[PDB]
């Protein structure tokens, strides 16, 4: 109903950014479903998706910091749940991603080591902005949790 | 050769994150190329890419805020170039993306309006964090641009 | 009392009067009042007496402006469009970007006039300064709006 | 490199679904010397047609950026960027928003019989436009001071 329209739009949000529709719909579903935890089979049914589709997109959302795998006592099935404060956890992963990109800027700067310094301006700006934003976000998340 | 390695690593960075390899390579190239502006054909031939591949991924990088389409005087070719302060521009786009997600959180909250408040906790957390971070990042970019 | 097609027509006129396409205005108007909110490409072409090409190109424009979104369903291979949540706020966010891009262009112009008398660059400086100020104003305002009004 | 900035302004316009010529014309009037330019001077500068200059100048006047003027002892039509042109452009945007908000009101009346949920989009539109009109008007007043 209105719920599946929300899930649909989460799919579009992802799709419009070159990410998978299914990952978006999965994130969406995990934001509104009841109970919060969902088995692999429940997700496949809910989303009209293959088990392979569920597995690969769940893996991606775990990588990005939004959801987690969990086990339920007495049950052998695989479960997933949106993490507590999931979008904060997402931002923590983005800090790590920014540091990774910083390291790549170094690679580029070394590669341009022989070239005029002006040519390296773009990479220096990238590295400097990333270093700045990592601190901004880390500090901000610290305060938020308080 | 060392430049090419950087470009490939940028491809890998994008690809590890469910984005296209070519978008990453294209961003990498626009970070290091000389001159900074590059024609569609220059990009395709530098990156071993089709025209369709260049067009699709250039458009994505424009969406993401990193590069711009460029018109060149007396020249009919399409050009692209890294935006000024490109990663700041990318962060501005992130603020906009966060605002879009916050709008969606509100849609979700309305959809759950008849359900117990507990069921909406996840969406409230999402909404609140996004609103907070949008403001934090906007303020920070303002302070930074004054450097 | 007005009806929906009078509104749609007037939205078309609003767009055309500003050198935008009439069909883009009518399409935006339709997506503001249609039920259901989501519409297929075919449904839009039918309702507006338009070609599939017209719907496609004008839908693309409204997406770029930030007002509408493309949707798709795995089982379905029709293209759907829908007005975005908080569409005009989203539109205003795109305007913030547009002003930033114009500010960057003003910088290009200022550099090109580097060897001219500074009086000649007054117009560009005014452009740059107004845009910087309005970007901040609008950004702050949309942040505050999201809280609610 | 002046023609480079001009060409780039043409691009900005064409990207937002306006004419390349209107963008080039605005660009030219931002950097030209003297600030005032005759119709023929504009056509020559931009390698443009007189009809193109006329049409696009009218649009830039409508948008608030430039003005048509007369020069004593001269028969020619002249144009010039307005003082604080982008503030003037913003003033015109406020007026455009008010017009658009009036249309939202038409839409709301047209849906008066329907369930109120169906009018949510139009209510959001109206609310945002009003809010922004107030914000921008306030901001422009403060800026001029
Ligand atoms: C090993 C580390 C793992 C970390 C977790 C994997 C990634 C988490 C999500 C990544 C999002 C993908 C962004 C793609 C564009 C890169 C832009 C960028 O990051 O910086 C710009 C952001 O706006 C600065 O301007
Ligand atoms: C008769 C009353 C006269 C008033 C003066 C008329 C002059 C109109 C100039 C301004 C409007 C330009 C056209 C835009 C129509 C869509 C709104 C917009 O541009 O797009 C969104 C894009 O993201 C921003 O919200």
UniProtKB/Swiss-Prot annotation, chain A:
DNA-binding region: 40-63
All copies of domain HTH marR-type, residue ranges: 1-138
Gene Ontology MF terms: DNA binding
Outcome when changing residue 75 to A: Decreases DNA binding
SUPFAM superfamilies per UniProt: Winged helix' DNA-binding domain
Coiled-coil ranges from the UniProt annotation: none
Keyword terms of this UniProt record: DNA-binding, Repressor, Transcription, Transcription regulation
Domain of life, source organism: Bacteria
Induction summary: Negatively autoregulated.
Phenotypic consequence of gene deletion: Mutations or insertions/deletions that inactivate MmpR5, or decrease its activity, lead to increased levels of MmpL5 and MmpS5, and to non-target based resistance to azoles, clofazimine and bedaquiline.
Function: Controls the expression level of the Mmps2-MmpL2, MmpS4-MmpL4, and MmpS5-MmpL5 transport systems. Also controls its own expression. Acts by binding directly to the promoter regions.
Subunit composition and interactions: Homodimer.
Name of the protein this chain belongs to: HTH-type transcriptional regulator MmpR5
Organism encoding this protein: Mycobacterium tuberculosis (strain ATCC 25618 / H37Rv)
Lineage per the UniProt record: Bacteria, Bacillati, Actinomycetota, Actinomycetes, Mycobacteriales
Name of the encoding gene: mmpR5
